[PDB]
Amino acid sequence: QIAERLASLRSQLPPSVQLIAVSKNHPAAAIREAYAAGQRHFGENRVQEAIAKQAELTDLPDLTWHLLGKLQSNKARKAVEHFDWIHSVDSWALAERLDRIAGELGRSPKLCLQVKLLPDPNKAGWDPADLRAELPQLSQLQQVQIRGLMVIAPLGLTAAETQALFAQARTFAAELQQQAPQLRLTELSMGMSSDWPLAVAEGATWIRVGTQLFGP
Incomplete structure (x- = not known):
């Protein structure tokens, strides 16, 4: 059952790590079951799939929604409106765009900057040199929380x-934090279904788990 799975996972984790339940292939009723077992952080890969599922669940006062996958700049408005955390901020343009929209809507998403430290064919992410160079401008974005x-x-x-x-x-995050004292760079969003134990041992604060928590 979900409660049993959640208990087992939480027993393996230190209090410094929060688990994001990846609800991508799972219905609202499973999210309610997880909530009853104590889960609060839920993650979706795609903006539209999340919106669809969110409407019935707004009774729940402290459910935190995390966007985990690629965010196109033309969906940034819906992401600001619907997510508490956006993990996949992969460029200066997207960060700027979210900040502009956040300011218009009076909202403040919490952001991770998705950095590409290795070559990857099928994935976006900041080039580390570009991220370091843009740190002063990132630090001046007033309407988001990096x-x-x-x-x-x-x-x-x-x-x-x-x-x-x-x-x-x-x-690198510790180096960036030294370079940007204005920023509250305390999180490491790393570790997915098959590699989260490696992530936790290397200091992850947010891990992403789907099937290990929910049913098949």
């Missing part, structure tokens, strides 16, 4: 190469 980095391993990366990646992310 809180950390998201790192996603390329598909097919080895366990060893993944460990090294997650360590490099931790290391």
